[PDB]
């Protein structure tokens, strides 16, 4: 409603940059701290993982750098980037192309 994350999917692997970038837009009336995390440890390097975003449509750009491939076979969770802002969370799935 008051904020959003683009794109809606992060693509790594064959044909892709080793680097993906997220854009987080804050349309609340006040400046907001965000935290950007991954639901699988030691899978990506997120930079910066915390920053402030200006209100009224300000935005921050966040690098996501894949460190290893996910192991669905080793029953890791389906990998997600999670952005947290105010009391809310938006998840962005990660795909690795073979």
Residue numbers in the entry: 1049 to 1146
Q: Which statements did the authors publish about this structure?
A:
Spd-2/CEP192 proteins, defined by a conserved “Spd-2 domain” (SP2D) comprising two closely spaced AspM-Spd-2-Hydin (ASH) domains, play a critical role in centrosome assembly. The conserved centriole/centrosome protein Spd-2/CEP192 (fly/human nomenclature) plays an important part in mitotic centrosome assembly in humans, flies, and worms and also in the diverged centrosomes of Dictyostelium, which lack canonical centrioles. In flies and worms, the phosphorylation of Spd-2/SPD-2 at centrioles recruits Polo/Polo-like kinase 1 (PLK1), which then phosphorylates the large coiled-coil protein Cnn/SPD-5 to stimulate the assembly of a Cnn scaffold, and the internal molecular interactions that allow Cnn and SPD-5 to assemble into scaffolds are beginning to be elucidated. ASH domains are present in several proteins associated with centrosomes, cilia, flagella, and the Golgi complex, but the functions of these domains remain largely unknown.
An evolutionary analysis reveals that most Spd-2/CEP192 proteins contain additional ASH domains located close to the SP2D domain (one in Drosophila melanogaster and six in Homo sapiens; see Results). To partially validate the AF2 structural models, we solved the high-resolution structures of individual ASH domains from DmSpd-2 and H. sapiens CEP192 by crystallography (DmASH3 and HsASH7) to resolutions of 1.93 and 1.0 Å, respectively, or by nuclear magnetic resonance (NMR) spectroscopy (DmASH1). Instead, DmSP2D is essential for PCM scaffold assembly, a function that does not appear to require the additional ASH3 domain. Fusions in which the SP2D or its constituent individual ASH1 or ASH2 domains were deleted all failed to rescue the sterility of Spd-2−/− females, but the ASH3 deletion rescued this sterility nearly as well as the WT protein, although more variably. In contrast, Spd-2-∆ASH3-GFP was present at centrosomes at only slightly lower levels than WT Spd-2-GFP, and it appeared to be distributed more evenly between the centrioles and PCM than the WT protein. A 3D-SIM FRAP analysis suggested that Spd-2-∆ASH3-GFP was initially recruited to centrioles and then spread outward into the scaffold more quickly than the WT protein. The deletion of ASH3 did not significantly perturb the assembly of the residual scaffold in cnn−/− embryos, but the deletion of the SP2D, or of ASH1 or ASH2 individually, appeared to abolish the assembly of this residual scaffold. Collectively, these data indicate that the SP2D and ASH1 and ASH2 are required for Spd-2 and PCM scaffold assembly in vivo, while ASH3 is not. In flies, the single additional ASH domain is not essential for the Spd-2 function (as Spd-2-∆ASH3-GFP can rescue the female sterility of Spd-2 mutants) nor for Spd-2 scaffold assembly or for targeting Spd-2 to the centriole/centrosome.
